[PDB]
Amino acid sequence: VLSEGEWQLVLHVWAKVEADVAGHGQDILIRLFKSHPETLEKFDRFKHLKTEAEMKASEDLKKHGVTVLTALGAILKKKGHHEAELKPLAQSHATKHKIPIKYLEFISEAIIHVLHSRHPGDFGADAQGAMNKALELFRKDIAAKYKELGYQG
Numbered sequence: 001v002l003s004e005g006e007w008q009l010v011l012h013v014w015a016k017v018e019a020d021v022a023g024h025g026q027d028i029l030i031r032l033f034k035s036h037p038e039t040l041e042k043f044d045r046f047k048h049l050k051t052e053a054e055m056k057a058s059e060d061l062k063k064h065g066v067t068v069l070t071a072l073g074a075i076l077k078k079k080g081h082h083e084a085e086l087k088p089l090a091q092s093h094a095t096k097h098k099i100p101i102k103y104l105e106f107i108s109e110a111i112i113h114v115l116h117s118r119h120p121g122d123f124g125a126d127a128q129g130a131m132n133k134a135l136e137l138f139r140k141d142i143a144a145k146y147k148e149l150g151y152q153g
């Protein structure tokens with residue numbers, strides 16, 4: 001359960017994300033795709049890009065980073081009371097996209113990396129701990145909804 005002060009740390013660095021959601025989305029997905037190339041396979045509109053400039057140049061990748069961060073920012077704003085927001089994610093992610101929990105760990109790790117890299121002044125140890133807790137709560141709750149839906153994840 002995060003404390004109120006930990007949610008404030010999470011939402012404080014997220015306001016920095018919100019100044020440029022698409023730029024942050026491209027960097028997060030580029031870090032994910034470079035760290036774990038196999039996740040790039042889920043994306044047919046850009047599964048063949050090979051360099052960072054290609055990926056920066058991709059309109060579909062840029063749109064997808066905004067899809068990811070818009071939904072993730074609405075979740076975090078719920079401060080853990082996110083069941084209604086997670087219900088549509090877990091449906092499509094369990095039945096159409098088939099996204100393993102290991103993949104949700106990989107992008108969490110990409111998210112923390114890009115936040116440290118772009119916002120180290122607003123993402124010190126305590127903020128990093130608070131964000132790691134919020135993403136760990138999101139992954140736990142998704143994982144349990146995937147099981148309800150018969151997807152192991």
Ligand SMILES: C=CC1=C(C)/C(=C/c2[nH]c(/C=C3N=C(/C=C4\NC(=O)C(C)=C4C=C)C(C)=C\3CCC(=O)O)c(CCC(=O)O)c2C)NC1=O
Binds near residue numbers: 039040043064067097
């Ligand atoms: C916290 C991260 C995160 C969130 C909140 C997220 C949200 C999210 N992903 C989407 C699509 C999708 N999401 C994925 C894939 C993934 N989705 C994943 O969680 C992971 C780690 C992969 C990694 C391969 C795919 C393949 C689509 C469809 C993309 C498309 O068809 O244009 C959509 C559009 C509607 C739908 O299909 O559900 C939303 C809102 N995606 C995220 O990555």
